[PDB]
Ligand binder design. Structure first.
Ligand SMILES: [Ca+2]
Ligand code: NA
Lengths: 281, 64
């Protein structure tokens, strides 16, 4: 039997599934460590690797990209977990090697591949403490070209009144996502700052792991793909909505939590986002 | 229980490993270049050490 991880329920993805919308024909690039395409609970539509020494994007030697992918789009069937957008066209854009790290140029090359291949949504469960002009240019170019770009905010917790949001999440064109638990409390590790946009479940999130496994991971990395998945659900119901409109729909229908420095606009609610008229619940 | 080591910035990667394993003997330590992009999952057992091109610590080590 299939299990629905609590986070998929918490963002109200099942309301879209019951309306008949599951992300069909929406192309989502998971820009990450690869995706294990052999997993029976995933279907990978395509991809490319930007890592010089790991040329197969369908081999995930870390595990992180496969876990993130399963939150976006684990298949709707009688096994494993259910994804947020289980009919999405999932693309493995490998920019991180086995050790979890990549050069800025590899991430930029991955973003450029996504734009050239007409991806509708990019998820980046990754980042670093400094930006670069070339990094900002790539994400701005993706957004100018119509792509919804979502990134994890970082797990740097608090530092007085300073922002601890990572790049590329910290750029205005990118939706930066923090982590809450099942009680809607911010995870203690979740980054904070005026750049924090929305929150999603990021504590004890069950998803797919390489070699036909499953497991619970923690992080803003786990929160980001709930929002990337939600963007795909929204586009599958409203295929003419622009990235601008998808982004506004998510921001404008969150359940508000605490102060925006710590919680941004609050927890996403994809049921409310995918209606025509938007308000917070 | 220590989770951040600001005193290790500017030290050798060797001394940082030694100190961190005294405070957290079961730590999974991974050395990475400063100025790379990394995964944003949270691992309470992990301490990443970000080094400059001389193999000195370039950023405050922390658990995660
Ligand atoms: Ca399934
Ligand atoms: Na941003």
């Amino acid at each position: 039997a299939q299990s629905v991880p609590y986070g998929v329920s918490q963002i109200k993805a099942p309301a879209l599934h019951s309306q008949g919308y599951t992300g069909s024909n929406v192309k989502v690039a998971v820009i990450d460590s690869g995706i294990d395409s052999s997993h029976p609970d995933l279907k990978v539509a395509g991809g490319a690797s930007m890592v010089p020494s790991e040329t197969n994007p369908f081999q995930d030697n870390n595990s992180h990209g496969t876990h993130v992918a399963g939150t976006v789009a684990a298949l709707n069937n009688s096994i494993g977990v259910l994804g947020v957008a289980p009919s999405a066209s999932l693309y493995a854009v490998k920019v991180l090697g086995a050790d979890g790290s990549g050069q800025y140029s590899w991430i930029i090359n991955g973003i450029e591949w996504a734009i050239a291949n007409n991806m509708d949504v990019i998820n980046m469960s990754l980042g670093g403490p400094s930006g670069s002009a070339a990094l900002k240019a790539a994400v701005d170019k993706a957004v100018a070209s119509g792509v919804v770009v979502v990134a994890a905010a970082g797990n740097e917790g608090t530092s007085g009144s300073s922002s601890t949001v990572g790049y590329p999440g910290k750029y205005p064109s990118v939706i930066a996502v923090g982590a809450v638990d099942s009680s809607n409390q911010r995870a203690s590790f979740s980054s904070v700052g005026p750049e924090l946009d929305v929150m999603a479940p990021g504590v004890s999130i069950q998803s797919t792991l390489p070699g036909n496994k499953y497991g619970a991971y923690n992080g803003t990395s786990m929160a980001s793909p709930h929002v990337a998945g939600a963007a795909a659900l929204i586009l599958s119901k409203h295929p003419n909505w622009t990235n601008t409109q998808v982004r506004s729909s998510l921001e404008n229908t969150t359940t508000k939590l605490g102060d925006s420095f710590y919680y941004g606009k609050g927890l996403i609610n994809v049921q409310a986002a995918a209606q025509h008229h938007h308000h917070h619940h | 229980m220590k989770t951040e080591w600001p005193e290790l910035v500017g030290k050798s990667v060797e001394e940082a490993k030694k100190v961190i394993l005294q405070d957290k003997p079961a730590a999974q330590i991974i050395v990475l270049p400063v100025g790379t992009i990394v995964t944003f999952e949270y691992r309470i057992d992990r301490v990443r050490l970000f080094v400059d091109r001389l193999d000195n610590i370039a950023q405050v080590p922390r658990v995660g």
